[PDB]
Amino acid sequence: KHTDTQEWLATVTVEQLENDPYPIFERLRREAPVAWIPAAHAWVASTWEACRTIADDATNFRGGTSPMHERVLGTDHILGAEGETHQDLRAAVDPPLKPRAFRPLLEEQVRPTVRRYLEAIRGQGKAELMADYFEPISVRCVGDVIGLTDVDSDTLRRWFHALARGIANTAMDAEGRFTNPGGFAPADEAGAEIREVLEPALSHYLHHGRPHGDPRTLEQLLPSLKVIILGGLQEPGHQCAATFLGLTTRPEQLKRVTEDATLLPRALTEGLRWMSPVFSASSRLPLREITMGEATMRPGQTVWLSYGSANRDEAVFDRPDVFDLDRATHPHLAFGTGRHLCSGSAYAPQVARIALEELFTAFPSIRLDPAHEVPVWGWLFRGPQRLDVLWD
Numbered sequence: 521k522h523t524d525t526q527e528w529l530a531t532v533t534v535e536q537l538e539n540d541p542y543p544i545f546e547r548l549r550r551e552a553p554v555a556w557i558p559a560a561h562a563w564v565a566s567t568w569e570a571c572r573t574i575a576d577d578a579t580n581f582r583g584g585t586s587p588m589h590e591r592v593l594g595t596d597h598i599l600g601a602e603g604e605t606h607q608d609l610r611a612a613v614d615p616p617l618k619p620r621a622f623r624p625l626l627e628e629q630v631r632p633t634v635r636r637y638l639e640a641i642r643g644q645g646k647a648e649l650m651a652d653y654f655e656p657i658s659v660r661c662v663g664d665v666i667g668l669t670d671v672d673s674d675t676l677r678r679w680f681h682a683l684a685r686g687i688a689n690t691a692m693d694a695e696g697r698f699t700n701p702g703g704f705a706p707a708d709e710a711g712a713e714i715r716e717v718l719e720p721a722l723s724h725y726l727h728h729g730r731p732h733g734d735p736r737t738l739e740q741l742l743p744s745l746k747v748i749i750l751g752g753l754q755e756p757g758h759q760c761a762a763t764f765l766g767l768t769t770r771p772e773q774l775k776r777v778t779e780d781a782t783l784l785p786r787a788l789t790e791g792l793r794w795m796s797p798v799f800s801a802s803s804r805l806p807l808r809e810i811t812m813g814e815a816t817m818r819p820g821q822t823v824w825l826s827y828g829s830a831n832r833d834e835a836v837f838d839r840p841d842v843f844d845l846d847r848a849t850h851p852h853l854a855f856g857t858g859r860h861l862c863s864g865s866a867y868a869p870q871v872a873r874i875a876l877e878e879l880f881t882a883f884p885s886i887r888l889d890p891a892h893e894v895p896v897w898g899w900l901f902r903g904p905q906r907l908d909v910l911w912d
């Protein structure tokens with residue numbers, strides 16, 4: 521209620537961003553590609569051009585961090601790392617995620633894992649695909665590829681939730697001090713248990729890109745391993761869910777996919793563009809004063825990269841709100857770009873491909889259960905909250 525971009529920006533709330541992000545980002549792309557949102561106490565980049573320019577600029581921005589990220593992940597986590605520290609951390613975590621390295625696991629581990637949960641839901645006769653199928657597949661396949669084959673999914677899942685709860689533990693006082701330190705304790709305990717597991721892919725972590733006499737240590741690596749458990753463990757499953765949901769909005773395209781599995785790589789890419797799971801949670805911080813258009817950002821301020829809005833940018837895509845398997849080919853920013861580009865960007869679509877291959881081979885008649893609704897939520901991380909389905 522009032523009695524004008526700046527005026528409007530001051531009224532936008534986090535709850536509106538969480539619940540109705542698309543019309544907000546539609547206005548932002550048009551009126552303020554880099555916008556300060558007072559309720560978010562941060563900048564948000566909404567266009568393809570602004571997101572790619574900020575994300576790729578290794579001279580004037582650094583990878584994002586925050587008090588919670590320092591508290592939960594530890595210092596020199598890979599997200600906020602730059603320079604030789606970042607190059608070294610990428611030298612540690614990237615090798616097992618390259619296609620030549622993970623290729624044998626696809627048929628030796630991933631597809632057998634998928635078929636285990638496929639059989640589980642087959643006995644059910646129907647399913648809530650996210651908790652019943654996509655999430656267990658994602659947790660197990662990411663846990664395996666990063667060298668935690670011997671950690672059970674129940675433990676990987678508890679670690680994920682403890683780290684997430686810690687990142688969400690933002691309550692602060694006027695001095696910038698956390699007021700709920702108890703909300704970090706599950707994350708602290710998770711970190712201790714990860715250390716307990718690893719202290720006795722892994723050999724690559726210590727040695728790859730390092731002098732044979734100077735390997736890495738566990739404390740140098742633990743922040744970046746927690747990054748993966750927090751941010752990698754669930755996202756292949758989220759890609760499956762965004763892709764499944766998008767296909768259901770185009771029945772004729774879903775039908776085609778169920779009769780031709782070679783269309784799945786394209787559907788999965790369009791799924792990521794249509795509902796980017798990491799919608800605005802990526803960020804950078806200015807290293808010096810930066811002015812883009814009318815936005816003057818200053819060192820230390822948070823700049824969220826709304827890759828999800830960039831992937832819905834009318835200047836790049838025609839009718840970007842529509843899922844379209846036959847869309848004119850174009851890259852997307854759902855994995856980011858530049859030096860911080862997702863280390864899992866080659867592995868995640870292969871897990872998702874095999875998960876959907878097996879799903880549509882066994883249940884080609886699969887469809888959303890019309891006795892249920894599909895709630896969709898979030899602007900930092902965005903996706904469906906469940907996917908109740910039926911099949912013949």
Ligand code: HEM
Binds near residue numbers: 864
């Ligand atoms: C479809 C699934 C996934 C999506 C959509 C996704 C998305 C993203 C995004 C948007 C970023 C930030 C890029 C930027 O700052 O510009 C990122 C970073 C990262 N992701 Fe993923 N991710 C996925 C899966 C995974 C998996 C499975 C792993 C590990 C096995 C992983 C590991 C990482 C790491 C280590 C980084 C940090 C890279 C750096 O800062 O240098 N991700 N991801």
